[PDB]
């Protein structure tokens, strides 16, 4: 039995970055050669050469799938900081895995604006590696409680993406699959 990697990459829908989808690959043969024969826009391996992975076995392999902007792809790399790295998808400095990204402007964009992809803008504290919260509780910036009401000095913690087909390269949607290696090639 071969690992269902195509069901991760060629899926019709990806999760939002504030609530990224952690897909577990297990008890299967992992063929990574397909991912090394693309024209994809980025392919970044940290500690795990793409020509070595086919000879390795792992306890588990995790594929985190989500949609972000092109300008935010650089925040996925380990040791980086920013609005995604700190409040949405934090990847550890000691990261072993590959980051695969491609432009999905033709799939994940709409003329009216695709608002089905949300990211977290505000938080009380920055995230730890591979942790995520899906809380929608009102974010308090001020010195007084608003009791859940988005009034003065209170904000809705989530912001939407508004992906559109005519955005620039760095603002067009990218489908990012992060392969974390904890399944034999």
């Amino acid at each position: 039995n071969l690992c269902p990697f195509h069901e991760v990459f060629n899926a019709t829908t990806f999760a939002s970055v504030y609530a990224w989808n952690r897909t577990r690959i297990s008890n299967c043969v992992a063929d990574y050669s397909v991912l090394y024969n693309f024209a994809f826009f980025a392919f970044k391996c940290y500690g795990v050469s793409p020509t070595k992975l086919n000879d390795l076995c792992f306890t588990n392999v995790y594929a985190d799938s989500f949609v972000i902007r092109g300008n935010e792809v650089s925040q996925i790399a380990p040791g980086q900081t920013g609005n995604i790295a700190d409040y949405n998808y934090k990847l550890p400095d000691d990261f072993t895995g590959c980051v695969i990204a491609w432009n999905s402007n033709k799939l994940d964009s709409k003329v009216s604006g695709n608002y089905n992809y949300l990211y977290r803008l505000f938080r009380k504290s920055k995230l730890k590696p591979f942790e995520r919260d899906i809380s929608t509780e009102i974010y308090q910036a001020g010195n007084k409680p608003c009791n859940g009401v988005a009034g003065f000095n209170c904000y809705s913690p989530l912001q939407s993406y508004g992906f559109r087909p005519t955005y620039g390269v760095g603002h067009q949607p990218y489908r990012v699959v992060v392969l974390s290696f904890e399944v034999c090639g």
Partner: antibody
Amino acid sequence: VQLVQSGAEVKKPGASVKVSCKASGYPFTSYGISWVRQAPGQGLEWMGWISTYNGNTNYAQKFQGRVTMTTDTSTTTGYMELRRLRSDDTAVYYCARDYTRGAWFGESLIGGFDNWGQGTLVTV
Amino acid sequence: IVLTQSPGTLSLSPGERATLSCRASQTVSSTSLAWYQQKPGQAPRLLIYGASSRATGIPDRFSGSGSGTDFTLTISRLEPEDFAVYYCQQHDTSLTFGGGTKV
């Protein structure tokens, strides 16, 4: 990739017909099998879908209760059966290898029905 | 979701451009639509998937695109071998096919 279906059969009303589909040229358990019917002079009508990995199925609302599907991994062959045949069920029954739904996770894929069999004619 | 195709009979001379349309009663994703070609006496084959992505083995004569409820299939130059019946699909809800058109 090729799909080889059985030859034509003639059935009386109330009888059942089971149509085989032998698949080769690819990993059997990596792709699902779909079935599509085409009555004479008509277009394509979907009957159902089955996974070759976990046996999960998905049937069209116009066939539910009549159509059942199974697979045999050891012979890399799919099977479909339509019971309680009506005079309106005369058609060519097609087997196809889909890329529309994942065989393992059951999620929708970006694709279509890539490989088709020659079609099995059932008269009733 | 209901798929309707038009025109029913796109009978055009060889060498000319040929276009077909498919409309949906409900919106579908560009992720979920495909076009098929059926020659007389033969099973249909996949031409385009994902609205615009060309299937393996298919000539560059075939191109297409679409979103929402409006999708199209274009043949840049009609060949003698392109005189077949074409179908549009969707798998956003259950799985269905359009009525089909003859070129």
